Each structure stands twice: as C-alpha cells, then as structure tokens.
RNA sequence: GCUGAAAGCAUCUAAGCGGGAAGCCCGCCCCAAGAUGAGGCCUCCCACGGCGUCAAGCCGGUAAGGACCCGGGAAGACUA
RNA sequence: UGUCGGCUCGUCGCAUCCUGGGGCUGAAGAAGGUCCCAAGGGUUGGGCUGUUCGCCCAUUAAAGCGGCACGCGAGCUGGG
RNA sequence: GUGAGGGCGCGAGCGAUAACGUCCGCGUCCGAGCGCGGGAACAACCGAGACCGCCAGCUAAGGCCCCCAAGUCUGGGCUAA
C-alpha cells in the first residue's frame, strides 16, 4: 500500500522578489506552497512549506501591465464594480499584487486557503524575525 | 483641529444687531485630558476628553486606574479627537471664538421601525381610486427574471434614526464662558441631552 | 565639447561647465564613450528602435553640453494696447487683457528677463525647461487669430 | 504643448517631461476587525486547591468583572 | 410564462438633452454649426385622448434616447 | 416493434449565396453509447464501442508554467498589440 505520511514539521523558506517576474515567482511560491516539491507529497493532509517573500515592490512586470493590468473588486452593491489599475496597488498595499497572484494559483479547495496562510509577504526586506530563514532563488 | 464635548440643552432665538437669528444652546463644561495618544504609543494623534462628574462608587471599574493614570475626577463619558493635542489639562469654551464655524456630531432621535414613506420620504400611493391596500406602500422593488433579485441597500422600511449624524458649518454665536455655554446656528442633531462633539469645519 | 566636464555614470551622464552641472538620464543599452576631450556614443545593433534611441541620445547629450556652455534663451513678443509686462524681481507680472494681473512664478534654473514692456527673454540652462517656459508664456494668452494680440515667440503673425 | 530621433529637414512620442475634465483616486459624511488575515491602546484581577504518570480533560470554590430581578427612558414590535 | 396604458420603486447602457472640457468653423463679439471627450448628477407643471405616440399652453440649463419578459398585476390600478 | 426524427459533413431546391430555418439525396454520430477521455462546462465536433476484477503496463484526442497529469524541453524565425 502506497506510503502513508505522518506529522511533519513546518519547513520555512525565505524567498527574494527583486527583479523577479511576478508570474514566474508566484508559480514556484505556489508549487512549493504545498509540499508538491517534496517526494512525500499528499493532497489530503496539506503539509506545505511556510513560504515568506520579501521585497514585494521590487517585482518586475512586462509590457504595458503597470498601465494595462486591471484588478476587479465587486461589492454586492449596484455599480460597485470598483476596479483598480496595477500601479495603484503598488502605491497602496503593494504586497497584495503577489498575494492575489499566488492566491489565484493555490487550489480552490478549503485547504488551499489553509495554504494561503503559509504565505507571508512584505517589502523591506525584514521579516518577522522568528527562526527559520532558508534563503532560496 | 479644535474639539470639545458637550450636550444639547435647548434652543431659542436671539437678536444679532437688528436681525433675528434662531440659535441652539450647547453646554461645553471642562473636559479633562485623559490620554494624549501619540503615533508612538498608537499610530494616530488624539486626546481622550472626559466629562460629567461621577459617584466614585459607580466607577469601581478599572476605570479608576485609568483616571488615576492622569489624576482626574472620575468623569462619566470620554471620547477622542483626531489630530488635536492642545495644552494644559483641560479644554473649554475659550477654544471657540464668536465667528468661527464648527461641526457638531450627534445622535438623531430614534424613529423606531419607521415606514418606507416616513423613512425615505417616498410618494406612497393613490388614496382614491386605487385599492385600499397600498396607500403607504413601496409598490415595486425589482424586475422580472433578470436580475431576479434585489439591489443591496434598496430603500425599504424599518428601524430608522437614532444614529450618527454630522451637521456642518454652524457659525459660533455668542459664547458665554461665564457658565461654559455655547451658542450655534440652531439646527443640531440629537435630543435635549444627547452627548455631542464640536469640531472645526472645513470651509478651506 | 570645449572647456566641458562630461563624466560618465552607469545609466546617466553628469556634465559640468561654466554654468554648472546638470544630470541627463542616459538610455540603458547605449555606450557613452569619452574619446579625447570630446564624447561619443554607439548602439548595440542596427534595428529600428535602436536607430531612434541613438540619434535621441546623440542630441540629448549635446544639449547637456550646450546647456552649461553658452546657455539657453528664447524671446517673447507682445502685441496689443494694454498688453504689456512688468518684471517684478524674480517673477514677472503682466496685464494682457484680464481683470486679474498675471503673476508668473520663476522656476529653479530659469530667469526670464525683460528688456522692454513687449520683449521678454527666457534665460535658463535646459532645453526641456526653456521649452516649457516659453510655451507656458504663450499659453497664458494665445495670439488673437483675427488681429494682433497676445504673446508671440518671434514667429510669423497669425494674421 | 515641450525636448526629440527614426527620417541631417520635419514631428506632441517612438525614451522621457509638463498643462488639461461636473468624470477617476483621495479628501467630506455614514457603517466597519465574523478584516476566522478576527488588528492596536490604557487600566483592573491572577496561580491548581484535587484526580490525569504523559498527551488530551474534568470538578466545587474564586478574582477583576458580568448576568438575573426591579423602577424607568426622546432608546424600542421582540430583543438589544 | 397575466396581456396596453397609468401608478409606485427604480437600476443599467451611452449612440449626451443639460451642466463639464475640447478641435474645426463659411469662429469679430454675442449667439450658433459640426465633431471628439465625458454619466457624476440633473432631465418641470398643465390642456386633449385608455392610449403609447403626438399636438398644444407656460416655462426651462435641459425638458435625452434605449435595456431590464418594450422592468415592475404573489406592489397597485383596470380607462384599453 | 417502427411509420414526429435530429445534429453534422457533402451535393441541390426554397430562403435573402438569412435563421439551433426548411425540403430531398450520399454518408456519419445521437437516437438507444446523457458510458468513458478531450473540447471550461455541452445528445450528436475530436478520441474511443464499457462482460466483471486489479493501488500493473504502452498509447489515442488533447496536453505537458500554477489551479492540473506530465518539458518553465531543444534548436531556428516572426509578433509589442
Ligand atoms: Mg508612461
Ligand atoms: Mg506615469
Ligand atoms: Mg458611488
Ligand atoms: Mg467540493
Ligand atoms: Mg416619528
Ligand atoms: Mg417625514
Ligand atoms: Mg425624510
Ligand atoms: Mg426618491
Ligand atoms: Mg404622489
Ligand atoms: Mg379596487
Ligand atoms: Mg373590490
Ligand atoms: Mg384585496
Ligand atoms: Mg411579474
Ligand atoms: Mg577622457
Ligand atoms: Mg561628437
Ligand atoms: Mg507649435
Ligand atoms: Mg530633428
Ligand atoms: Mg519639431
Ligand atoms: Mg503643431
Ligand atoms: Mg504613432
Ligand atoms: Mg477635476
Ligand atoms: Mg474642478
Ligand atoms: Mg470612495
Ligand atoms: Mg494537579
Ligand atoms: Mg485544557
Ligand atoms: Mg446584570
Ligand atoms: Mg422615484
Ligand atoms: Mg445612483
Ligand atoms: Mg463647449
Ligand atoms: Mg464648441
Ligand atoms: Mg475667437
Ligand atoms: Mg458675426
Ligand atoms: Mg452613483
Ligand atoms: Mg397629469
Ligand atoms: Mg385634467
Ligand atoms: Mg377639463
Ligand atoms: Mg382623458
Ligand atoms: Mg394621459
Ligand atoms: Mg398628433
Ligand atoms: Mg412652448
Ligand atoms: Mg427606463
Ligand atoms: Mg410590461
Ligand atoms: Mg406590468
Ligand atoms: Mg393586480
Ligand atoms: Mg400593466
Ligand atoms: Mg410578479
Ligand atoms: Mg369596477
Ligand atoms: Mg371609457
Ligand atoms: Mg369596452
Ligand atoms: Mg402516419
Ligand atoms: Mg443547401
Ligand atoms: Mg422543423
Ligand atoms: Mg432541421
Ligand atoms: Mg441523416
Ligand atoms: Mg446506439
Ligand atoms: Mg446504431
Ligand atoms: Mg451506434
Ligand atoms: Mg443522468
Ligand atoms: Mg469533457
Ligand atoms: Mg463529454
Ligand atoms: Mg478486462
Ligand atoms: Mg505510457
Ligand atoms: Mg500531442
Ligand atoms: Mg493544462
Ligand atoms: Mg525559440
């Protein structure tokens, strides 16, 4: 019978974001967000690595984007389709730009939301100096 | 950003120079500073202003410590005033000069479960030819299959009033420090006794 | 490029002269050579956008030089009766057919001059600047296309 | 409209830069941390007293403090 | 799957009636013509007819067009 | 038993070289294969005809960056919307 994994300790990770293509980054962030990279994978349990990203604003993006990209925020109210350009996001709370990205890439499942928590993002760097900090690229 | 608490005491009318002007009467007794919160200690600037005295026995709450923290007679109520760190230990009616305009926030009278017509001053319905079933009735609300639902916030009857209402640019009339009184341009939210705040309007 | 002091940086070039120093944002993929006491520039290829970029920097670099060399100055004519101008220290106030006297702020690095109530020069150290300042003036009261009024550069009459 | 090449000229643009709408973002007013991403501040009370070897819990008494009940309100269907 | 018009409540579109800005003009100025940008808000009372439609009176900054089962009869009316 | 058929490709009439239009013909699937893979979902388009089991193995269509299995494959060009 296929291997039956058990309780695994949260392996944290420290990832950069300077001059990084928004997408190309988020992909890995998601890939590694779930333990999909560890051969001992298991969809049921949800034991992904705690991914922390720094230097959010630094993120690079191609073509028009900055001026082109548009985000959709629909409140339940009439004409509440309030929409925001990319730049604006980088102005207000830039961290979002990557969040909503990874967010949209994690499985739609309820444990995916649980994986969203394993995702901490800021721009400084300077993370909440806890313990783990395995840098990567 | 001037800011002082008070209560609506009533309203009559005075005579400016040779003209009649309806005015409201507020009472801005001394409001002891309680906690000058700086951006360091919090993130915004403000001041906790106390108010009415208190039976020291009723305030047996930890409020005792908070009061003693600044060393003041146990007040009854206390709120904040964003962006306003003045001086001394108490604000007064001396803050406002006859001529300055102020913003006063109050608690509107509660009109209970009020009817649509009363609430949003609707039109109602025919009192004559039409069936005696829809006199004060919203009538229609939506469409057919599309969209099939109701636009969120659609004006409907219900509990209305008794909320936070802010009237603006009321000019400060004759202010008498001799009794902690303050006169304004009349129309002020809240009944005769409601806790209201008086700030600085935004003409420019 | 005589008596100049062109000093090259990564993505920009700092040029110094009698008038002073000025920064000029230089394109990325361009080689700002500094042969002898003069300056050269080449391009990484022979494509369309690169031709444009070269010629662009080509002059853009010559501008930084001339800017701290002999300086930049444009003229301004004025037609019409009341249409005149009174220099007030730095800023200049000129009534040109408005109930309110026009007060013109003096930006940094620019000092427009007034030899006559009609003629007004535009002293500066940057083409982009003098370019805007010159237009900013004509923008105040464009020429009357039916006769002669408003502020002109020095070009033909609108007739 | 500027500087400005492609394209020795020219050009408001292809790099960049400025001005410009009752519109947009903010500003004003109202709700609002069920913002389960549950934020922050100030102050008050503090030990287990006994089983559980562990881990996971329970129990009668307490503290700060709250609730019930009662008189009552420009608050209010009810409840709050 | 109740069918006009009316009432009530609206909300959305933009191909804009008004107010906003702008180009050209056979644009002196005023006033206007036409095209572009631009829904945020506004977009009257009345006579006749079941009417929609339209005609008319008086005014207006203007008295916009159209979608929502030509919106809305478990909201109303019932003249058609 | 059936005597409403339908979609589709192709060849024609009608239609307007219109219609998820219609009327014959040749074939095909659906019908009755709403069983499976692909196509986001989807009777008829692409793959392929389910006797039952299996925590084996190659492949079909499509696909091989994340939701998603499997290349951010390799080499050479084009396209800045
Ligand atoms: Mg740009
Ligand atoms: Mg920009
Ligand atoms: Mg709104
Ligand atoms: Mg499910
Ligand atoms: Mg009432
Ligand atoms: Mg009323
Ligand atoms: Mg009302
Ligand atoms: Mg209304
Ligand atoms: Mg009515
Ligand atoms: Mg009836
Ligand atoms: Mg009856
Ligand atoms: Mg009835
Ligand atoms: Mg209906
Ligand atoms: Mg040298
Ligand atoms: Mg040279
Ligand atoms: Mg010109
Ligand atoms: Mg040229
Ligand atoms: Mg030119
Ligand atoms: Mg031109
Ligand atoms: Mg072009
Ligand atoms: Mg504006
Ligand atoms: Mg404005
Ligand atoms: Mg808003
Ligand atoms: Mg014990
Ligand atoms: Mg426990
Ligand atoms: Mg109680
Ligand atoms: Mg209405
Ligand atoms: Mg609205
Ligand atoms: Mg106009
Ligand atoms: Mg015009
Ligand atoms: Mg003219
Ligand atoms: Mg004329
Ligand atoms: Mg709106
Ligand atoms: Mg009528
Ligand atoms: Mg009548
Ligand atoms: Mg009559
Ligand atoms: Mg009639
Ligand atoms: Mg009628
Ligand atoms: Mg007619
Ligand atoms: Mg008329
Ligand atoms: Mg409508
Ligand atoms: Mg209808
Ligand atoms: Mg109806
Ligand atoms: Mg009915
Ligand atoms: Mg009807
Ligand atoms: Mg109905
Ligand atoms: Mg009857
Ligand atoms: Mg009749
Ligand atoms: Mg009849
Ligand atoms: Mg038969
Ligand atoms: Mg045919
Ligand atoms: Mg048929
Ligand atoms: Mg057919
Ligand atoms: Mg057939
Ligand atoms: Mg079959
Ligand atoms: Mg068959
Ligand atoms: Mg078959
Ligand atoms: Mg079925
Ligand atoms: Mg499928
Ligand atoms: Mg299928
Ligand atoms: Mg078998
Ligand atoms: Mg295989
Ligand atoms: Mg293939
Ligand atoms: Mg895929
Ligand atoms: Mg390639």
* HSE-CB of B114 using CA atoms within 13 angstroms: 16
Contact partners, residue C112, CB within 8 Å, separation at least 6: C92, C104, C106, C120, C121, C122, C123, C133
Tokens for C7? 């000093």
Q: Are B104 and B171 in contact (CB under 8 A)?
A: no
Which residues are registered as beta bridge partners of C74? Answer: C122
- Record the resolution, in angstroms: 3.2
Is strand E less than 7 A from the beta carbon of B129? yes
CB pairs under 8 A between A and B: 7
Rounded CA-CA distance B49/A67 in Å is: 47
Tokens for C29? 């993929």
Which residues are registered as beta bridge partners of B184? Answer: B24
Q: Are B38 and B83 in contact (CB under 8 A)?
A: no
Q: Are B111 and B194 in contact (CB under 8 A)?
A: no
Rounded CA-CA distance C43/C26 in Å is: 13
Chains that touch B (3 or more CB pairs under 8 A): A
φ, ψ (nearest 5 deg) of residue C32: -85, 80
Rounded CA-CA distance A32/A40 in Å is: 13
Contact partners, residue B121, CB within 8 Å, separation at least 6: none
Question: No. of H helices and E strands in chain A?
Answer: 4, 6
Instruction: Name the helix (H) or strand (E) containing B113.
Output: strand B110-114
Cα B130 to ligand 13 centroid, rounded to whole Å: 19
Q: Are A121 and A131 in contact (CB under 8 A)?
A: no
Beta strands in chain A (DSSP E): 13-15, 51-53, 70-72, 83-85, 119-121, 135-136
Which residues are registered as beta bridge partners of A109? Answer: none
What letter would DSSP give residue A37? G
Q: What is the CA radius of gyration of chain B?
A: 23
Strand nucleotide closest to residue A31 (CA to C1'): F66
Q: Are B22 and B186 in contact (CB under 8 A)?
A: yes
| A79 touching chain B per CB within 8 A | no
Instruction: Name the helix (H) or strand (E) containing C146.
Output: none
Ramachandran category for residue B21: left, alpha or beta (phi over 0 → left; psi -120 to 50 → alpha): beta
Residues in chain B: 204
| B147 touching chain A per CB within 8 A | no
Q: Are C118 and C84 in contact (CB under 8 A)?
A: yes
CA triple B172-B174-B179, angle to 5 deg: 110
Cα B5 to ligand 2 centroid, rounded to whole Å: 46
Tell me the CA end-to-end span of chain C in Å, nearest whole number.
42
Q: Are C133 and C124 in contact (CB under 8 A)?
A: yes
Which chain B residue's Cα is nearest to A78? B151
Rounded CA-CA distance B120/A106 in Å is: 46
Strand E nucleotides, any atom under 7 Å to a protein CB: 6-13, 27-29, 40, 68-73, 75-78
Distances B134 to A97, B16, B140, C145 between C-alpha atoms, Å: 52, 49, 11, 66
Within 10 A of C156 (CB to CB), how many other CB atoms are there?
7
Rounded CA-CA distance C124/C73 in Å is: 6
**Torsion angle in degrees (nearest 10) through CA of B19, B24, B29, B33:** -110
Q: What is the CA radius of gyration of chain A?
A: 17
Which residue, chain included where needed, has tokens 């406002």? B96
Tokens for C118? 């009609």
Q: How far is A78 from chain B (nearest CA, A)?
A: 6
Within 10 A of B125 (CB to CB), how many other CB atoms are there?
16
Rounded CA-CA distance B109/A7 in Å is: 59
Q: How far is CA B174 from the centre of its chain?
A: 20
Q: Are B184 and B103 in contact (CB under 8 A)?
A: no
Residue B171: closest CA among B66, B21, B9 = B21
Rounded CA-CA distance B139/B45 in Å is: 49
Is strand E less than 7 A from the beta carbon of B119? no
Contact partners, residue A125, CB within 8 Å, separation at least 6: A54, A55
The secondary structure of chain C in percent helix, strand, coil, rounded to multiples of 5, reads: 20, 30, 50
Q: Are C80 and C148 in contact (CB under 8 A)?
A: yes
CA triple C47-C53-C54, angle to 5 deg: 90
Residue B73: closest CA among B27, B29, B37 = B29
Rounded CA-CA distance B125/B135 in Å is: 5
What letter would DSSP give residue A60? B
Beta strands in chain C (DSSP E): 5-8, 12-17, 20-25, 31-33, 40-42, 72-74, 77-79, 86-87, 92-94, 102-104, 111-113, 121-124, 150-152
Rounded CA-CA distance B76/B61 in Å is: 12
Q: Strands C77-79 and C86-87, how do they pair?
A: unpaired
Instruction: Name the helix (H) or strand (E) containing B93.
Output: none
Q: How far is CA C142 from the centre of its chain?
A: 19
Separation between the CA of C145 and the C1’ of D54 (whole angstroms): 98
Burial class (CB in 10 A: 0-12, 13-18, 19+), B27: middle
Which chain A residue's Cα is nearest to B152? A77
Rounded CA-CA distance C134/C72 in Å is: 11
Long-range contacts of B175-178 (CB under 8 A, 24+ apart): B175/B93, B175/B96, B175/B97, B175/B98, B176/B93, B177/B92, B177/B93, B177/B94
Which residues are registered as beta bridge partners of B13? Answer: B22
CB contacts of A78 in chain B (<8 Å) are 151-153
Which residue, chain included where needed, has tokens 């550069």? C153
Q: Are A55 and A96 in contact (CB under 8 A)?
A: no
**What would the DSSP string read from start to end of B44-72?**
S----B--S---TTTT-STHHHHHHHH--
Rounded CA-CA distance B148/B4 in Å is: 50
Residues in chain A: 137
Within 10 A of B44 (CB to CB), how many other CB atoms are there?
11
Instruction: Name the helix (H) or strand (E) containing B38.
Output: none
Q: Strands B181-184 and B20-27, how do they pair?
A: antiparallel
Residue B169: closest CA among B145, B185, B154, B181 = B185
The answer to whether the peptide bond before residue C141 is cis (omega within 30 degrees of 0) is no
Q: How far is CA B155 from the centre of its chain?
A: 24
Residue B105: closest CA among B125, B79, B67 = B79
Tell me the CA end-to-end span of chain A in Å, nearest whole number.
36
Q: Do chains B and C touch (3 or more CB pairs under 8 A)?
A: no
Rounded CA-CA distance B45/B39 in Å is: 6
In the sheet that holds A119-121, the strands lie side by side as A119-121, A51-53, A13-15, A135-136
CB contacts of B151 in chain A (<8 Å) are 77-78
Tokens for C79? 């037609």
Q: Are A21 and A61 in contact (CB under 8 A)?
A: yes
Which residues are registered as beta bridge partners of C78? Answer: C151
Is strand E less than 7 A from the beta carbon of B144? yes
Q: Do chains C and A touch (3 or more CB pairs under 8 A)?
A: no
Separation between the CA of B167 and the C1’ of F21 (whole angstroms): 67
Rounded CA-CA distance B180/C41 in Å is: 78
Instruction: Name the helix (H) or strand (E) containing B161.
Output: strand B158-161
Rounded CA-CA distance C156/C159 in Å is: 8
The answer to whether the peptide bond before residue A125 is cis (omega within 30 degrees of 0) is yes
Rounded CA-CA distance C61/C55 in Å is: 10
Q: Are C73 and C19 in contact (CB under 8 A)?
A: no
């Amino acid at each position: 019978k296929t291997y039956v994994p058990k309780q695994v300790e949260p392996r944290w990770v420290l990832i950069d974001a300077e001059g990084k293509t928004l997408g190309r980054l988020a992909t890995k962030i998601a890939t590694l967000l779930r333990g999909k990279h560890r051969p001992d994978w298991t969809p049921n349990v949800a034991m992904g690595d705690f991914v922390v990203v720094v230097n959010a604003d630094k993120i690079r993006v191609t073509g028009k984007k900055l001026e082109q990209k548009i985000y959709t925020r629909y409140s339940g109210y009439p004409g509440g389709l309030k929409k925001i350009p990319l730049e604006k996001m980088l102005a207000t709370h830039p961290e979002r730009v990557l969040e909503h990205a990874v967010k949209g890439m994690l499985p739609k499942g309820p444990l995916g939301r649980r994986l969203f928590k394993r995702l901490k993002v800021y721009a400084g760097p300077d993370h909440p100096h806890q313990a783990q900090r395995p840098e990567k690229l | 950003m001037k800011g002082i608490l008070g209560v609506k005491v009533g309203m009559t009318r005075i005579f400016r120079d040779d003209r009649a002007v309806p005015v409201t009467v507020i009472l801005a007794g001394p409001c002891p500073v309680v906690q000058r919160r700086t951006p360091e200690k919090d993130g915004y600037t403000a001041v906790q202003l106390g108010f009415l005295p208190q039976n020291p026995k009723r305030v047996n709450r930890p409020l005792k410590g908070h009061f003693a923290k600044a060393g003041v007679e146990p007040v009854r109520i206390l709120r904040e005033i964003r962006d306003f760190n003045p001086e001394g230990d108490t604000v007064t009616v001396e803050i406002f000069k006859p001529g300055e305009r102020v913003d006063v926030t109050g608690t509107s009278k509660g009109r209970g479960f009020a009817g649509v017509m009363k609430r949003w001053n609707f039109a109602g319905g025919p009192d004559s030819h039409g069936a005696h079933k829809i006199h004060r009735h919203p009538g229609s609300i939506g469409n057919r299959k599309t969209p099939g639902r109701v636009y969120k916030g659609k004006k409907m009857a219900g509990h209305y009033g008794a909320e936070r209402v802010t009237v603006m640019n009321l000019e400060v009339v004759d202010v008498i420090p001799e009794e902690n009184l303050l006169l304004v341009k009349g129309a002020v939210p809240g009944p005769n006794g409601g806790l209201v705040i008086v700030r600085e309007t935004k003409k420019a | 490029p005589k008596g100049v002091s062109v000093e090259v940086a990564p993505g920009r070039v700092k040029v110094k002269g009698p008038k002073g120093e000025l920064e000029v944002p230089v394109s990325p993929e361009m080689r700002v050579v500094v042969e002898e006491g003069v300056v050269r520039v080449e391009r990484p290829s022979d494509e369309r956008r690169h031709k444009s970029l070269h010629g662009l920097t080509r002059t853009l670099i010559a501008n930084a030089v001339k800017g701290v060399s002999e300086g930049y100055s444009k003229e301004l004519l004025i037609k019409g009766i009341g249409y005149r101008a009174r220099l007030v220290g730095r800023a200049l106030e000129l009534t040109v057919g408005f109930s309110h006297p026009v007060v013109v702020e003096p930006p940094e690095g620019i000092t427009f001059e007034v030899p006559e109530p009609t003629r007004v020069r535009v002293s500066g150290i940057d083409k982009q600047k003098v370019g805007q300042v010159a237009a900013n003036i004509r923008a105040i009261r464009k020429p009357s296309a039916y006769h002669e009024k408003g502020i002109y550069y020095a070009g033909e009459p609108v007739r």
